[model samples]
Structure formats: structure tokens, C-alpha cells
Target: AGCIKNGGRCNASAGPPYCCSSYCFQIAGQSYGVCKNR
Candidate 1:
């Protein structure tokens, strides 16, 4: 679970909102993202 930053909301509403409020993505089976508030 994750959240988009700087008002960058994702289309995840199709299912459910992510938990971690910052960012999320899959890479080699690992999810990660660098968050920055504008």
C-alpha cells in the first residue's frame, strides 16, 4: 500500500487506496518510490 505525493493521486481508486502515503511501485518484486511535498 502507498500514496502519491504532491497531489499526485493515482487511479488506484479502482480497488482501494494504498496505505503508505508517499509513493509505491514494483521493481524486481520490490515496491519503492521517492516522495517529495511541493
Candidate 2:
């Protein structure tokens, strides 16, 4: 499988496949986190 790209759905913090080549971008507990480049 490939890494999660920007705008890609992601969970947890920015790291590894979760973030992929990017990072997991989130806000609140209910907020949907997405892999984004920071």
C-alpha cells in the first residue's frame, strides 16, 4: 500500500503510514483528521 497523501483521511498523530509522506492533521476529538503536509 502507498502512503496517505495530503487531504487523505488519517487517524492519530502525524507519523508513519497514518501520516504517510505527510502528517495527520486534526483538531478536536470529534474532528476528522486528515493527512496534510505541514
Candidate 3:
């Protein structure tokens, strides 16, 4: 399991980080937020 942004939802016990219904990322180790769905 991994961290999530403010509004996103995930079942940490069910899977891994990037497997969330949504997720976020870092920019050169700077700002971060939720990623648009694929």
C-alpha cells in the first residue's frame, strides 16, 4: 500500500500503490497531485 492524494480512493489491503483507482506523482521531487485516469 501507498499514500494517496486528498480526494482519491484506494483499497490498500487489496493491492499496491500505482494500482489505485487514481494516483499521484512527484515532479523532480517537487509538487504532487492526483493523476488523470487511464
Candidate 4:
């Protein structure tokens, strides 16, 4: 479980190596975001 840089916080629990701080989609009470280029 780790995180990546994408102008947001990464959630390993949400999806390893994925950003989960924006464009957050809620599913099963979990918000999942995508990696953005800034």
C-alpha cells in the first residue's frame, strides 16, 4: 500500500497507487479519485 503525487491525497485502501482526493466517486461508502496532471 502506497501513494502517488497528483495534487491530492492518495488512498491505498481505496486503490493502491491511485489519488483519492478529487473527482471523488463514492461507491460502497468509499470515495475514489483519479490522478490529475497539474
Candidate 5:
């Protein structure tokens, strides 16, 4: 249930170590932008 490496296609959500406050819900709003790496 953890996250993957940086810029990982399969690691957009779940549980990240840190971010610019970007997360699962937020990414879902931005079209899974969690891969953007803040």
C-alpha cells in the first residue's frame, strides 16, 4: 500500500513520503498529475 519511485506511473497515490502537498485526491482532480513530481 505504499508509493513507488519518483515520476512513477504506478505511484501516483497511496502513501508518499513527501510532496508539494500533492496527493491522491488532488491528483485525481488534476487528471492524475501526481506524476508531475510537484
Candidate 6:
């Protein structure tokens, strides 16, 4: 699945200031997608 913001949602927030899927991690019923490097 794609990355999403800390809203415990799905791959809806896969753009804009919340585009980070290479490093996704769940926390407190939320997804913390880390940003890319370089």
C-alpha cells in the first residue's frame, strides 16, 4: 500500500506535504511515513 499521514487512514494522502512511502511506520493508530533522502 502507499504512504499516508498520521490519520490512521489509507493511501489517500499520497501527495503534497505528506508524500512519504519509502519509510512507513504505524504509531498510535497512525501512519508515520518517513521522507526520502537525496
Each model's backbone clash number:
0, 0, 0, 0, 0, 0
lDDT ranking, high to low: 2, 4, 3, 5, 1, 6
RMSD of each: 7.5, 3.6, 7.6, 6.8, 6.5, 8.7
On lDDT, the leading prediction is 2
Tens-digit lDDT track for model 5 on 1-38? 34534553433455444443343224455344343344
List of clashing residue pairs for candidate 2 = none
Q: Write the per-residue lDDT of candidate 4 for residues 1-38, one digit (tens) a residue.
A: 44444545544455645453333223344554444444
Candidate 6 lDDT over 1-38, as tens digits, reads 46444332323244424444333333443444344422
Models sorted by TM-score, best on top: 2, 3, 4, 6, 1, 5
TM match of model 6 to true structure = 0.19
Q: Which candidate tops TM-score?
A: 2
TM-score of each: 0.19, 0.47, 0.25, 0.22, 0.19, 0.19
- Model 2, which residues run further than 4 Å from truth? 13-17
What does the lDDT come to for candidate 4?
Answer: 0.43
Pairing residues by index, what is the TM-score of model 5?
Answer: 0.19
Off by over 4 Å in 5: 10-34
Please provide, for model 1 over 12-31, each residue's C-alpha lDDT reduced to its tens digit, 9 standing for 90 to 100. 33433453454543233323
How accurate locally is residue 12 in candidate 6, as Cα lDDT from 0 to 100? Answer: 28
Q: What tens-digit string does per-residue lDDT give for candidate 2 at 6-31? A: 56776654432456656777676765
**What would the per-residue lDDT of candidate 3 be over residues 1-38, giving only the tens digit for each residue?**
65334544433343425634355433433234443344
Candidate 6 residue pairs in backbone clash: none
Q: Where is the poorest 10-residue window by lDDT in model 1?
A: 25-34
